[PDB]
Amino acid sequence: GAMCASRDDWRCARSMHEFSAKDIDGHMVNLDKYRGFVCIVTNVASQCGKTEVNYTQLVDLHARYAECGLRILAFPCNQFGKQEPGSNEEIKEFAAGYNVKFDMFSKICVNGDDAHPLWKWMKIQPKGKGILGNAIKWNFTKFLIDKNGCVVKKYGPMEEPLVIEKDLPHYF
Fold it and tell me: How many whole angstroms separate alpha carbon 100 and alpha carbon 92?
């Protein structure tokens, strides 16, 4: 199986819960807090052709299903056509404009050596493995995380968020 020299290597992680991430305000978030919750993890951007549909539908799913245990982690990323160039503060007010109430994080990379460790891990999960590379291909890729922090499904850049709604009852 997985073999790591350093005890805290992402390759040997077994759950999203073992990771931490800086939030859009600059404060470290222990993702073990999502133990017990069903999560959508997505890479977002403000100047993308699917920005409007993804944000409005994510807000809609979170508003309707948060009482059911649904949580959403949005990671801004500037790597896909450079369509997230603003600062964290400007991105945060952009999301405020959609009445986002889920969890925004600080801008990261999702591909490369400096990609956030959580995303390195998600990309190698059997239900999160890509096509000839594992690398995230565009803005608004989405991962469904079950209550145990495991990746159970992935939805492509051009699958609007509402197509996740039919899979959520399986994990509540």
Answer: 9
Q: Residue 50 belongs to a domain with what CATH number?
A: 3.40.30.10
The 3-state secondary structure of the chain reads CCCCCCCCCHHHCCCHHHCEEEECCCCEEEHHHHCCCEEEEEEECCCCCCHHHHHHHHHHHHHHHHHHCEEEEEEEECCCCCCCCCCHHHHHHHHHCCCCCCEEECCECCCCCCCCHHHHHHHHCCCCCCCCCCCCCCCCCEEEECCCCCEEEEECCCCCHHHHCCCHHHCC
